[PDB]
Structure formats: structure tokens, C-alpha cells
């Protein structure tokens, strides 16, 4: 088992039984930039014995880098301790737990005592007590926040509880990882710790977002009941079923659904909520409820209705001119929305409050595909297509929306691929030369993090200053650039910055 801190602390050893300075001084700018990262166990059995060598053999010299090093080994270890999350809660929470143990560890009272002991420094920025403070914080505001979204989820899993419904107030995506992205944070954040655990927290949080919007349209008054029973349909056949059990039902819920569809006009047939195939197949008709004169459907959430308008549009259907007026206006208004807004939250809420539910824009992009197979489109067509194009697309990146470094990485993968799935839609409505790779970008564009890579670039240069200042009254110390060129290559490399220094 040979590892970066593992082969500098068996380099250090043999260094004390200016050949010294070269070796242990190329020896650090060798740990600062090596390729591989520390595993916990490591960090765990390592850290004493390094620090140990590292604050006598500090003693004996008096170089301004053994100085910093120690002073800031906790954070450039945090910095590069591995963290790998597991899908399931328990095992996530546990694995996040050995590394605050293991933090713990790396702060200790010993680092403080062997610090002082070298006349050294512990308030560094990256010192125990500050990489403590901060990681502690972080993580335990973590726990809070991840299992407090984590409980107003939707439970269908085996595990036991009975999922939460008129519990639910309408959550932002980026609401719960907010309070972690601070710039009191920005000493700590390409920690792969905090980057985990904000892809972890954005995965449960985004869920909880989506859930959270369609709940609130399942208890809106204003809505007709054939709307409220459609969202009720869409909610269980979406978030609350698996193929492991069939239906996940709340007893209220199911009541509420029983008491709402009974006020349906019989010319609309409803399935109760019951266990294959999803509920909202089940539901025929054959009246046209598009029509003004009509009252069924609520001409706010007028594409909640997934059959009338799937067969709309695949059969190409030619409705009456009244009902189409009242198309046009609900599809040219939430188009018009989406086309000129940068907040996600909006063009998510908007997209449900339309009736544009995830699984709907997936089977209308197949209904207009399916179209154009055959046969170019008319207006409702035309506008279906660019809602449900960007619809699919925004719903898509809404499930990872984080400020987390692979974000990027999956957000560079959806837009490159989003208008080339269906590309005979995309080019027909006009999103063909780039124009929906536009419009995803301004709205679901990945935050730039600049400003903590230069807050924690400022941080390294000040301990870089005190450090050298007390051990060189000059300051020409030859390992900034290796202390910087992790900074730049960081950015370069998660977050694809330029880069550039000032
Ligand atoms: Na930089």
C-alpha cells in the first residue's frame, strides 16, 4: 500500500536520521500536485507520524514552507480526501459520517499541541481549528437539511411510512443547497465532501421540488374537478408508483380522489385509484373538451388531459376554431414565458401549472414524431412541440440541478443531445441551428464559481504571506506556483474555468 501522503511520509522519514532542502522541498511541490487523492484509512493512519516529522523537521531548518504546510495540512487534505455516496439514505449518512470522524481526526487537540509545539501557527485558514468549524458546520446543516427534504418525499420504497401529502409548500431547486454555497463555504468547496454531498442533496431536493409543484396542483379550488382528478392520475401514476408495488396511496388521498371524480359529468370515464399500465391510458371519452362552450377542463391547466391531445396530435386533428383560440392563447402564453425567463423555478412551475407534466412532454414529442413520420404542422402543433421540447429537456436537467462540479459535465451532455433527439420536430418548429442549446443554457446554465476559487486563491496567497514573512523577511518562496497551479488546474479541470489570475 503506497499512497501520496503515504510516500512523503516514508520520503520524510529517511530525511531525519542542502541536500535536505532540495529533497524534502521537491518533495512537497511533488504531495502538493500528486495525480491520486487520499483515501480515509490513509489519512487515518498517516496523519500523526507525517506531522510528527514534519513539525520537528520543521524544528530543525526553519523554512517558511514546512511552516505552511503544517499549518494548512488539514485543509489541502480536505481538499483531497475522497468521498464516493451510495445511492441509498443509510449508507450515505454513514459513509459521510466516517469522514467527519475522519476530520475529527485531522483536528485534533495533538495537531494544536504539535503546531505551538514548533512555534507554528493554528488559526490558519486551513488550520485545524477553522478546517474544523467549517466542516463541521457544513456537515451537520447537511444531515439536517438532506433528511428534512428527505422525509417530504415521496416514500414509495419499501421502507415503511406513509408518504406526506398537504404537507408540502412549494420548494425552489436550489432552495435547500442555497445556505451551503455561501462564501463563508468558499475555503472548502473544491472538497470533494462538499461537491458529493451537494450532488447527493441536489438529487433529493430537485424530486422533492417537482413533487412539491404538483401536489399544490392537486389542492387548487379554483381548478374543475376533471382537472384536480387528472393531476390526482399524473401524481400517482409518476410518483408514486414502482414496478416493485403496483399503487403507493395515501387513505386521504384516495378518499379526496373518490369524492372529486364522483362530481365528473358520466361522458368522462375516470379509473379509480386502484393496481399493468398507468392510470391515465385508462381514461376514455369522446367528447371534444377543448370547446370554449365546454366547461370540463379548466383553461388554465388545459394540457393536463394526456389522451384527448396525444390523439390531437398524432391524427392531426382539426378542432373546432373556438377551442383552438383557447389553445393558442394558454400555448402562445406559457411559450412566450418560457421563451423569455432565466429563473428555473418559474418555467418549472409554469410548465405544471400548464398541465405539462414530465411524462406528457415525453408522449407528445413521440405524438409529433410519430407525426411527421407519416405525413409541416399546424399552430397548436407547432407550440406543443416547442413545450414539450424544452419541457422535456428542462425536466431533465431539473433532476440534477446543482452548483456542484458535475453539473457541468451532465449539463454539457443534455444540450448537446437536446436537439438531436426528435431532430424532425426541432428543425420543423425552428429550434434546429442551436436556438434550444440557447435557450436551455440561459435558463439551466451551470453557476460559475470564480469567485471561491479567487477567495481561497486570496487565502493561500495571505498564509503564503505571514508564513514567508516570519521565515524569509523577503518573500521569494519557489512553491507558489505549485500551490497555485492546483488552483488553476481544479478550475480548468472540474469546472472548465479559462483560467486566469490577476
Ligand atoms: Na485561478
Redesign the pocket.
Known amino acids: 500500500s503506497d499512497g501520496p501522503m503515504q510516500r512523503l511520509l516514508a520520503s520524510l522519514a529517511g530525511l531525519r536520521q542542502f541536500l535536505a532542502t532540495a529533497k524534502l522541498r521537491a518533495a512537497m511541490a511533488a504531495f502538493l500536485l500528486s495525480g491520486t487523492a487520499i483515501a480515509p484509512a490513509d489519512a487515518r493512519d498517516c496523519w500523526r507520524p507525517l506531522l510528527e516529522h514534519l513539525c520537528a523537521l520543521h524544528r530543525a531548518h526553519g523554512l517558511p514552507e514546512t511552516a505552511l504546510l503544517a499549518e494548512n495540512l488539514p485543509g489541502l487534505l480536505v481538499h483531497r480526501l475522497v468521498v464516493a455516496l451510495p445511492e441509498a439514505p443509510d449508507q450515505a449518512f454513514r459513509e459521510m459520517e466516517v469522514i467527519k470522524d475522519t476530520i475529527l481526526a485531522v483536528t485534533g487537540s495533538d495537531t494544536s499541541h504539535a503546531l505551538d509545539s514548533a512555534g507554528l501557527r493554528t488559526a490558519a485558514a486551513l488550520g485545524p481549528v477553522r478546517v474544523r468549524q467549517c466542516a463541521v458546520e457544513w456537515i451537520d446543516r447537511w444531515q439536517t437539511v438532506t433528511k428534512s427534504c428527505l422525509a417530504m418525499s415521496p416514500r414509495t420504497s419499501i421502507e415503511a411510512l406513509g408518504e406526506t401529502s398537504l404537507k408540502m409548500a412549494p420548494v425552489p431547486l436550489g432552495q435547500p443547497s442555497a445556505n451551503l454555497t455561501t462564501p463563508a463555504y468558499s475555503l472548502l468547496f473544491p472538497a470533494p465532501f462538499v461537491q458529493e454531498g451537494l450532488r447527493f442533496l441536489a438529487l433529493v431536493s430537485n424530486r422533492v421540488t417537482l413533487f412539491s409543484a404538483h401536489l399544490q396542483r392537486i389542492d387548487d379550488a379554483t381548478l374543475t374537478p376533471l382537472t384536480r382528478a387528472l393531476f390526482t392520475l399524473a401524481l400517482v401514476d409518476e410518483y408514486l408508483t414502482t414496478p416493485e408495488r403496483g399503487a403507493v396511496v395515501p387513505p386521504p388521498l384516495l378518499a379526496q380522489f373518490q369524492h372529486t371524480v364522483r362530481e365528473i359529468d358520466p361522458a368522462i370515464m375516470i379509473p379509480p385509484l386502484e393496481a399493468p399500465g398507468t392510470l391515465m391510458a385508462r381514461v376514455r371519452t369522446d367528447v371534444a373538451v377543448f370547446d370554449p362552450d365546454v366547461p370540463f377542463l379548466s383553461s388554465s391547466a388545459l394540457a393536463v388531459f394526456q389522451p384527448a391531445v396525444s390523439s390531437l396530435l398524432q391524427l392531426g386533428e382539426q378542432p373546432s376554431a373556438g377551442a383552438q383560440q383557447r389553445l393558442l392563447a394558454l400555448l402562445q402564453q406559457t411559450w412566450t414565458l418560457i421563451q423569455n425567463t432565466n429563473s428555473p423555478s418559474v418555467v418549472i412551475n409554469t410548465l405544471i401549472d400548464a398541465g405539462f407534466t414530465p411524462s406528457h412532454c415525453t408522449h407528445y414529442l413521440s405524438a409529433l414524431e410519430g407525426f411527421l413520420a407519416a405525413g409541416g404542422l399546424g399552430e397548436v402543433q407547432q407550440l406543443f412541440g416547442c413545450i414539450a421540447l424544452a419541457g422535456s429537456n428542462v425536466f431533465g436537467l431539473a433532476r440534477e440541478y446543482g452548483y456542484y462540479a458535475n453539473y457541468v459535465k451532465t449539463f454539457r451532455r443534455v444540450q448537446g443531445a437536446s436537439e438531436h433527439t426528435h431532430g424532425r420536430l426541432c428543425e420543423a418548429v425552428g429550434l434546429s441551428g442551436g436556438v434550444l442549446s440557447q435557450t436551455l443554457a440561459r435558463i439551466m446554465g451551470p453557476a460559475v464559481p470564480t469567485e471561491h ?2 477567495s481561497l ?1 486570496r487565502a493561500l496567497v495571505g498564509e503564503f504571506e505571514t508564513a514567508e514573512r516570519r521565515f524569509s523577511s523577503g518573500q521569494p518562496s519557489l512553491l507558489r506556483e505549485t500551490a ?1 497551479i492546483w ?2 488546474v481544479y ?1 480548468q479541470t472540474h469546472w472548465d ?1 479559462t ?3 490577476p
Open positions: 476559487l479567487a486563491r497555485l488552483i488553476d478550475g474555468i483560467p486566469t489570475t
